[PDB]
Every structure is written in structure tokens, then in C-alpha cells.
Amino acid sequence: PRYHLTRQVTLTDLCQPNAERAGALLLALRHPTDLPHLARHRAPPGRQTERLAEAWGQLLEASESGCARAGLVSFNFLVAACAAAYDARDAAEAVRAHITTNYAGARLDRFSECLRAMVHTHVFPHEVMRFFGGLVSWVTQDELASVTAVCSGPQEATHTGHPGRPCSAVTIPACAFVDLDAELCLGGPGAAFLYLVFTYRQCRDQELCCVYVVKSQLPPRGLEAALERLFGRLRITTCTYAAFAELGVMPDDSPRCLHRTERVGVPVVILEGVVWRPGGWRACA
Amino acid sequence: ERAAVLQAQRTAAAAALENAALQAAELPVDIERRIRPIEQQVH
């Protein structure tokens, strides 16, 4: 009802929202203790399915589940772990100088191996680490976590201005200037429509991983042909690359920004006021 | 009508020179490998 709260209790083995900002684009870790099984399934047999059986098992080595399940994945944890992967180096790698000095690359180095291992046996990282929200409160303990980081529509980025009279809260960073892909340089007035695309390269760049947000005034039917155009990573043949879901609407193109100040100087984009339509994924081609 | 044909056959015979000259580009070539590494065996 244009105001909501959500809560999930996890570890600070992941994100450590005390080390994060007020605004972070958190993922969950849905199906967290999963993927020894789907490592074996869904893949052609020339993939040697005994890889992800150890790969995530080295992740939780860096992080026993207990009663606090592994979840609440940060936005930072994918950018820096794919910083060596995608076509941005020493600028996407500044996100690694953000994590290891505030969060830890010990958990990144096990997971950057997963980013070559999950995509190896066709266990693609879409529909795992589902969207959760914008890190409203961080009522976490010392080594444990209790976060309210509301899902559920536009209210996450409305309930940002009301709590603090001075300046603005959250205000939804992009966490890398390489991220927030400036699509539609053919510029005009309107509202922004935000999406979460994982662009792949399968056996060319040896199972590439990518996390960035697009910028478009485009419908979901005007986004799939926009997903066929503008890419140079078509050179594959397996298949089902470039999944995407809706991060929702920023109902203003006027409030985007260009900064390099956060929390290590990391480039960052302020985005004020967002209808967080949670959307749905699609991956076929 | 003859003068076009009598030219086009002549242009063919002008081209058949370097069709054959580049085909005769092995006559000082096909002899070195069949003589030179055989005489130091005799040595």
C-alpha cells in the first residue's frame, strides 16, 4: 500500500551492510545450499559436472549453515568479482578496492571461481540471487545479520526522503560509472526503465560473467530486440545468453548524476526516486 | 567482325605468355634440389 517492509535474517558472512552504504542494490541468495545437484543436471555431458560440487563448497569456506542461512548478497559482490571478467579493468577493479577494504576478497576469490564454474555447467546465475531491495535498515548484530531491505514496489525509493529531513537517504547508487550502462544516447525527455542484465560469453571468454544496469525508456517488448542489437558478444554458436528482469521504473530521467564519492574513491551515480517494479526473468536465446 | 576476334585472340596469346612464363618459372628451379645435396654425399 505504497509503504511496505520486508525482513530476512542471514549472516554478515555475505554483504555486511554495516560495511555497505545506506543505498545498495541487494540480492538475496535464494536456493542457497543448492547446486551440487543442478551441477549434474541441465548440462550436456561435455561439461564435467564435478566442478560446482566443490566450487560453492569453497565459497562457504570463505562464506555450516546452522539457523542463519547464507543470503542477502550485496550489489558490490558481483561487480568486483566480475571486474576481472568483463570489458572494464582498473575501473571496475576499483569496486574490489571498495570491497576488500570494507567488507574481503577471500569471499570474492572463491566466488570468482564460481563465476567461471556456475556458468561452466550451464548453471547460469540468473534465477539464483533473486532481487530483494535497497537496504533500508541494518538492525544486524556484530557477526550476524538482521536487515530490513524492502521489496514490494515503488515504496522502497519513496520511504527514503521521509525518514531523514537533511539531504536524502539511499538515493539508489549505481556503485560503478562503468555500471549504469548509458544506453539511449539518442536523448529525449521521459521516464527511465531499469533492468538487470547478465551478459554472457560461453567458451569464447571461457564463461564470462557480467552485472550492469541498463538505461532506457523502452518497453519489455522493445527491450528484447534492444538485447539483440548493441551487443558484440554474439560469437557463441552454447545458447541462452543475456537474461534480464525488471529493476523497475525511475519515473524521471532528470535526477541521474555523476559522482566518485562513496562511504577508496569509487565512481558512483545518484538515482533519486524509483518505482521498484520487481519484474520477471527471461532467458531463451 | 574479324578485327574484334583477331584482337581478342591476340590478347589471349599475350596473356598466354605470362600464363606460360609463370608456368615456366620452375625450369631454373626444378634442378637445384635434384643435384646439390647429392654431391656432398659423394664427398
Binding site: 571468454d205 558478444r233 560469437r235 | 574484334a4 576476334v5 585472340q9 589471349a12 596473356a15 605470362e18 647429392i38
Partner: protein, 554 residues
């Protein structure tokens, strides 16, 4: 590069059963187009359509026009395959420049257990636009096109220079190379000047079966001995996958075996290139389906005429004729036909096929001009153009000026080349009538020329000064005692704005699908000519004419 590759996807056609074929990569350079009559500026303005058809030498029909591909790139066209250009790294391979032209591979008619037929011509056509003025025609026989073997021996020096230039690029640039490129360099230094692509043509080395060249070396280095007593190519992929960032199947065969053979053109003394890769399903590839070519007709009719010293094989001995016919049975055409419409055993047999049509129409013109102008004529007029009072004294000259023109029109009709005659209106109006005894080529004919007989189609010659043609386009003017003129519906030519016979210094000359033509003079003074009473074109002669000059409309 890819125009050689995408035509192989049309060679991947296969499916429904038909006479089995091949494919030859042929690189025409700049002056072989320029001496042909191809404007190099207009094709420089990369995928481009080429209409191709193939023609036998002795007898028979032709192929319909096949839509093909092209890649016209002004560069070192030999050196661009050999030293390609990464967008980030154009100095990956510095080279020596050369001439350049269009990249077009061309298919080959064969047999079951293919014995290719020399003297038989595949005809190219470059279409700048629709018009016949935007068209040229090229001639290529298989004697011109097919070498017996290629020269992949020149590919041996090239590939290890590639590994040294991956050893050269990282050492110059240093730490600016990324993590996948700083590995694959030194993995090519543990495996052992510019690259001139023209030396791969001019160094005398080619292909050999080499089984005779192993026994000639095994019995050579045993004399010697009796007296005495992952590869580098896989590191080339990461050499490209780090410097480019992708696979690029265009560049994938620049790493494999490349033969670059020089040949020559029998029409204008020119040179061109015969290319075969390793992984090409085309001819000379090392992944190719049998049947392949056989150089047997190029050795039978030669040596039976060379050992017998028979200079022309119609002077071949009667047993020496039929014994070749007992060997190769497709030669009954060029040896035992009474009047073949294509001339047997000549180089310009396709050219002499054309020049007859240039002749036979001029007599159909020249004895028809005499027909309507037998004696003193009465022509009175056919159009409606009114005079001013002193304007009649201009026609006082046209009385005196008149008879020198009709020589010089026919002199200019002689004076054109027949290759330049087929772009004019009379050479296509007959094709609109020989298709009526089928849509002729370049589609210069409008949609409404085939409706009435009142749709004529003009050419325009200069009356005064020199008697010269003043058009590119056949200008089709619909004509209604009297009848006033009317145009049709619709890069800038001067004379194309007026009605026929409307003004001075213009001779107007129109023709029909009925092939009853007009000769329109300024002032309405015009008259029909029954050239249909003088066109003597035999249909079996004309049926090889139309099929080379018609287009099957969809």
C-alpha cells in the same frame, strides 16, 4: 574475406539432385576492373550484389542470372587476408601495400567425376543501379580461372612470422597487454622484417605430392647416415581472443593454410588472383567433397593437336577426331555440328556471337531505311508544332542539311561498340520483341511498354556539329493524321527534358514492341518504318541471344 565465406554458404545449398559443382575464389584487382570499363569510384562508394550466369563454349543455352556477393575493398587485397587489422591493434602485422579490388568467389560447372570444360565462360555483371548504363559484363574461361595446383608452400613462411609478431607486439608494448595476451607471446618464442604479400606470388614454389620427394630425400640422407654410422596454433587463438576480444570467423582462416596464386586474364592482358584456404568447401580446400576437377580436356585436345601439330582442330585428322570422341564424348558439339550458333574452337567465340547481332540488325536497319525512302517521299508531318514567322527559314537549312545525317546516323551506329550498343533503345526494343516471338535485362523497360503499340522508346542524336548520341537513358514517350506527344512517369543529363522532335539540334529515334520504329525530325516531320519486314533473326540463333539477355521476372 566474408564474401568469400558467405558464398560458401550458398555452396552449402546441396539438397535436390542436379549436376555437382565447385567454387573458386577469384580476386580481381584495380586495373583489371579499370581496363575493363568499371568505374572504381562508383564501387568504392561491403556486401554488394553480383548477377552471374555461365555459358558453354560449343553450343547450348546459358544459366539464368544468379545473385551473388562481393566485397570491394581498396587495400592490399592480398595483404589484407595475410595481415588483417584488429580495431584496437592495426599494427599487429605491419606489411607491404599492394593493389586491391572486389572479393568474389565463383562457382564451377562440373561432371559426375568432374572433368571441367575449358573455353566455357562464366559471365559476371556488376549492377551499380538498375540501368544498363549502370552495368558491365565480364568474361572468364576455366583455362583462365583453374590452375592445376595451388601454392600453400608460401603459407609456410607466413605462419611462423605470425608467431614472431606475437613475440614482437608484446615486447614493444609491454604491460599494456592484458592477462591473456601476456601469456601467448612467450609460448610462441619457445617454438622456433615486414610481411610482403606479393612475394608469395613471385617466389617460384607451389604444391607437390611430396611422396616422390621423400624417397628422393630418404635415399639422400641415408648416405650421410651410412658414413656416420598443445601446438603453436592454439596459442594463436588466445593471441586473437585477447587482442580482439572475440572469435571472428573472418580471421579464423587467416591462421590456417592460405595459398595465394597469381594468374592472368585473356581479355585485356591483366592479372588476377586464385585463392584457396584449407577449411574451404570451395576448390583447393583441404575439406572438400568429391567429385573434383580434372584437367583432361585441357590435355586431350591440346596434345592431340600439339603432337600432330594441328593448329586448328577443324584441321584435325578424321581418325584423330573420333578417337578423341571415343575418349571424351561431350566434344560432338564443337566438332560435328553443321552451323552451331556459337563458333567452335575460338577465343572470341562469345564475342563473335555478339558482333553478328551488331551486324544483322544494321542490315535490318539499313535495308529498312531504304524501304520507306525508296523514291521521292511524301512525309508530310506527324506531330503538332506551330511556327513563328521567321522560324521557317531555319527549316530552309533543314532542306539543305538533310541527307548528310542519315549516313552519319548509320555511321555512328557502326561507330559505337556493340558493348556500348546494348545500352541504347533499339538494342532493347528488339529484346522486347524477341521476348515476344520474357523481360529483358536491366529492367529499363517500363511497366506499361508491354501494354500498347503506342508506347515507343527513343534515342537522341545530335544534329549539328558532330553527330553524337546525347543520352544514357531510352526516353519512352507515349505517342497518340496528327498526334501530340506525352511522357511517361518517373544522375542528371542535359537533353532528357524535351519532347521528341520538339526543337532544333535534335534527332529523335523511337522503337516499339511491334518494332515499327520512328525517325522524328524537328517540326513534326516524321514517318514510321517497317523494320519488322527486315529483321531476319533465326529463332534457334535468337534463343541463345535472348536467354543471355532476358531476366526471369518474379
Amino acid at each position: 574475406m566474408n564474401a568469400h565465406f558467405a558464398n560458401e554458404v550458398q555452396y552449402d545449398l546441396t539438397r535436390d539432385p542436379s549436376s555437382p559443382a565447385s567454387l573458386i575464389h577469384v580476386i580481381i584487382s584495380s586495373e583489371c576492373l579499370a581496363a575493363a570499363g568499371v568505374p572504381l569510384s562508383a564501387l568504392m562508394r561491403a556486401n554488394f550484389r553480383v548477377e552471374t550466369q555461365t555459358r558453354a563454349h560449343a553450343t547450348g543455352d546459358c544459366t539464368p542470372w544468379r545473385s551473388a556477393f562481393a566485397a570491394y575493398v581498396p587495400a592490399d587485397a592480398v595483404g589484407a587476408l595475410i595481415a588483417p587489422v584488429v580495431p584496437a591493434h592495426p599494427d599487429l602485422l605491419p606489411r607491404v601495400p599492394s593493389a586491391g579490388g572486389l572479393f568474389v568467389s565463383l562457382p564451377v560447372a562440373c561432371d559426375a567425376q568432374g572433368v571441367y570444360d575449358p573455353y566455357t565462360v562464366a559471365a559476371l555483371r556488376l549492377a551499380w543501379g538498375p540501368w544498363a548504363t549502370c552495368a558491365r559484363v565480364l568474361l572468364f574461361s576455366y583455362d583462365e580461372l583453374v590452375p592445376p595446383n595451388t601454392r600453400y608452400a608460401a603459407d609456410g613462411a607466413r605462419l611462423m612470422r605470425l608467431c614472431r609478431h606475437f613475440c614482437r607486439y608484446v615486447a614493444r608494448l609491454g604491460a599494456a597487454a592484458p592477462a591473456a595476451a601476456t601469456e601467448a607471446a612467450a609460448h610462441l618464442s619457445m617454438g622456433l622484417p615486414p610481411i610482403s604479400p606479393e612475394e608469395q606470388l613471385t617466389a617460384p614454389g607451389g604444391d607437390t605430392a611430396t611422396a616422390e620427394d621423400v624417397s628422393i630425400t630418404q635415399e639422400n640422407e641415408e648416405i650421410l647416415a651410412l658414413v656416420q654410422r598443445r601446438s603453436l596454433v592454439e596459442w594463436l587463438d588466445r593471441g586473437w581472443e585477447a587482442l580482439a576480444g572475440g572469435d571472428r570467423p573472418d580471421w579464423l582462416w587467416s591462421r590456417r593454410s592460405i595459398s595465394v596464386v597469381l594468374r592472368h586474364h585473356y581479355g585485356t592482358k591483366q592479372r588476377f588472383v586464385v585463392v584457396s584456404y584449407e577449411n574451404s568447401v570451395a576448390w583447393g580446400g583441404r575439406r572438400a567433397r568429391p567429385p573434383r576437377l580434372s584437367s583432361e580436356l585441357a590435355t586431350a585436345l591440346t596434345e592431340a593437336c600439339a603432337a600432330e601439330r594441328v593448329v586448328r582442330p577443324h584441321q584435325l585428322s578424321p581418325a584423330a577426331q573420333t578417337a578423341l570422341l571415343r575418349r571424351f564424348p561431350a566434344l560432338e558439339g564443337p566438332l560435328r555440328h553443321p552451323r552451331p550458333v556459337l563458333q567452335p574452337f575460338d577465343i572470341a567465340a562469345e564475342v563473335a556471337f555478339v558482333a553478328r547481332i551488331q551486324i544483322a540488325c544494321l542490315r535490318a536497319l539499313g535495308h529498312s531505311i531504304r524501304a520507306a525512302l525508296q523514291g521521292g517521299p511524301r512525309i508530310f508531318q506527324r506531330l503538332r508544332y506551330d511556327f513563328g514567322p521567321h522560324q521557317s527559314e531555319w527549316l530552309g537549312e533543314v532542306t539543305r542539311r538533310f541527307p548528310v545525317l542519315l549516313e552519319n546516323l548509320m555511321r555512328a551506329l557502326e561507330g559505337t561498340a556493340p558493348d556500348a550498343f546494348f545500352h541504347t533503345a533499339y538494342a532493347l526494343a528488339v529484346l522486347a520483341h524477341l521476348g515476344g516471338q520474357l523481360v529483358p535485362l536491366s529492367d529499363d523497360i517500363p511497366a506499361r511498354f508491354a501494354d500498347s503499340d503506342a508506347h515507343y522508346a527513343f534515342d537522341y542524336y545530335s544534329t549539328s556539329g558532330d553527330t553524337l548520341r546525347l543520352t544514357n537513358r531510352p526516353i519512352a514517350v507515349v505517342i497518340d493524321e496528327q498526334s501530340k506527344c506525352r511522357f511517361m512517369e518517373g544522375p542528371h543529363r542535359v537533353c532528357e527534358q524535351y519532347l521528341p522532335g520538339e526543337s532544333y539540334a535534335y534527332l529523335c529515334l523511337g522503337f516499339n514492341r511491334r518494332l515499327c520504329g520512328l525517325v522524328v525530325f524537328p517540326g513534326g516531320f516524321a514517318f514510321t518504318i517497317n523494320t519488322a519486314a527486315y529483321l531476319s533473326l533465326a529463332d534457334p540463333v535468337a534463343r541463345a541471344v535472348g536467354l543471355r539477355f532476358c531476366r526471369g521476372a518474379a
